[PDB]
């Protein structure tokens, strides 16, 4: 099966702070709109729900689901 | 950045029917629990409908697949 190499790099780092996702600090969080931002960038919007900056839908108030696809890919437990 | 190759293969195919995700037929759909199943397998579980995830027993309440979010990460990868 094919795969896009440039797109694979984009999805592994937060589109805001441009740092690569981690399991704890920059944990990839799934907004209800489907876009993914890290936990730290998500904390900035926690000062008040949360409005996604790419599509203008808002995510309600952390019981947010993790981006399980990203976490499995960057898993290096072995 | 590093990445798990075997895990990268797992996430690019439906964990139920073992078919690789596509953009239309086997479109990867995001359940509310965070797990992803293809568009075709989801119709089978919506035929018996909410939708029950077969890996974690959480339920997703939908009446049409257009209400479920796509897995934007998978779709970007296979674009
Ligand atoms: Zn970030
Ligand atoms: Zn969004
Ligand atoms: Zn399937
Ligand atoms: Zn589940």
Residue numbers in the entry:
A (entry chain A): 7 to 54, 58 to 70, 74 to 90
B (entry chain B): 7 to 55, 58 to 87
Question: Any passages from the paper?
Answer:
TRIM E3 ubiquitin ligases regulate a wide variety of cellular processes and are particularly important during innate immune signalling events. They are characterized by a conserved tripartite motif in their N‐terminal portion which comprises a canonical RING domain, one or two B‐box domains and a coiled‐coil region that mediates ligase dimerization. The RING domain of TRIMs adopts the canonical RING domain fold that recognizes the ubiquitin‐loaded E2 conjugating enzyme (E2~Ub). To understand the role of self‐association and gain insight into the mechanism of TRIM‐mediated ubiquitination, we have analysed the properties of two TRIM ligases, TRIM25 and TRIM32, which differ in their domain architecture with TRIM25 containing two B‐boxes compared to a single B‐box2 in TRIM32.
In contrast, a fragment that is extended by 10 and 9 residues N‐ and C‐terminally, which are predicted to be α‐helical, is dimeric at all concentrations tested, suggesting that TRIM32 might dimerize in a manner similar to that of a number of homo‐ and heterodimeric RING ligases such as the BRCA1/BARD1 complex, where N‐ and C‐terminally located α‐helices form a four‐helix bundle (Brzovic et al, 2001). The extended RING domain of TRIM32 crystallized as a dimer with a significant proportion of the dimer interface formed by two α‐helices located N‐ and C‐terminal to the core RING domain, respectively, that form a four‐helix bundle. Dimerization buries 970 A2 and the dimer interface is formed predominantly by hydrophobic residues located within the four helices. RING dimerization through a four‐helix bundle employing regions outside the RING has been observed in a number of dimeric RINGs such as the BRCA1/BARD1 heterodimer or the Rad18 homodimer (Brzovic et al, 2001; Huang et al, 2011). The RINGs of TRIM32 are constitutive dimers even in the absence of the rest of the remainder of the protein or additional binding partners. In contrast, we could not detect activity for the monomeric TRIM32 core RING domain. However, the extended dimeric RING showed a similar level of activity as the B‐box‐containing fragment, which was further enhanced in the tetrameric TRIM32 RBCC construct albeit to a much lower extend compared to TRIM25. In support of a more general role of this acidic residue, mutation of the equivalent E16 in TRIM32 also disrupts catalytic activity. This effect is similar to the mutation of I85R, which interferes with dimerization, similar to V72R in TRIM25 (and EV2).
